[PDB]
């Protein structure tokens, strides 16, 4: 229950976050995969024990006392725009329920479905706006992690535009 709930963005490996829990951009089978999920597998391998969860869902597995929230955004290559948008909205909502359940003051979160699950489309505002819609009713400090300076720039732009 953080005192003045904020949004920030950082450009670095989420595996090196300074928050009380991490959201893994997970695949539905609980496999190490690539991208966020790979660095995450290296840092918190124990968290992948029974981490498999359906598209549009989030499952928490504790590494000791450190929660890893496995959130499965849809692969837009496999879904329609409409159904993909529904599953992506749902995954973020499930992240919010988990963050609330875990009582944490802060969460590190990537933009779900913006990398190899994007179906070769820019889904920054789509993914970010679904993140906001889900996390705006929580009181955790939210720190969004990205790899690209132009993604970093536009995310902050979008955060600042609400303040
Ligand atoms: O946040 C980000 N999502 C991305 C997807 C593809 C390439 C770069 C990025 C980012 O920096
Ligand atoms: Cl992705």
Swiss-Prot record:
Q: Anything noted about its domains? A: In the N-terminus, the macro domain displays a mono-ADP-ribosylhydrolase activity. The central part called, the alphavirus unique domain (AUD) has a zinc-binding function. The C-terminus region, also called hypervariable domain (HVD), is mainly disordered and binds several host proteins. This intrinsically disordered domain contains 2 SH3 domain-binding sites and 2 FGDF motifs necessary and sufficient for the formation of nsP3/G3BP complexes.
Q: Please state the span of the N-terminal signal peptide per the UniProt entry.
A: none
Q: What's the stated role of this polypeptide?
A: Seems to be essential for minus-strand RNAs and subgenomic 26S mRNAs synthesis. Displays mono-ADP-ribosylhydrolase activity. ADP-ribosylation is a post-translational modification that controls various processes of the host cell and the virus probably needs to revert it for optimal viral replication. Binds proteins of G3BP family and sequesters them into the viral RNA replication complexes thereby inhibiting the formation of host stress granules on viral mRNAs.
Subunit annotation: Interacts with mRNA-capping enzyme nsP1. Interacts (via C-terminus) with host G3BP1; this interaction inhibits the formation of host stress granules on viral mRNAs and the nsp3-G3BP1 complexes bind viral RNAs and probably orchestrate the assembly of viral replication complexes. Interacts (via C-terminus) with host G3BP2; this interaction inhibits the formation of host stress granules on viral mRNAs and the nsp3-G3BP2 complexes bind viral RNAs and probably orchestrate the assembly of viral replication complexes. Interacts (via C-terminus) with host NAP1L1.
Q: What is the effect of changing residue 117 to A?
A: Partial loss of mono-ADP-ribosylhydrolase activity; complete loss of ADP-ribose 1'' phosphate phosphatase activity
Q: What range(s) does the Macro domain occupy?
A: 4-163
Could you describe the post-translational modifications of this protein?
A: Phosphorylated by host on serines and threonines.
State the source organism's domain of life: Viruses
Protein name (record):
Non-structural protein 3
Please tell me where this chain falls within the complete protein, as first and last residue plus total length. 1334 to 1493 of 2474
Q: Where in the cell is it found?
A: Host cytoplasmic vesicle membrane
Impact of altering residue 13 to A?
A: Partial loss of ADP-ribose 1'' phosphate phosphatase activity
- Topology with respect to the bilayer: Peripheral membrane protein
| Residues bound to ADP-D-ribose | 13, 27, 35, 115-117
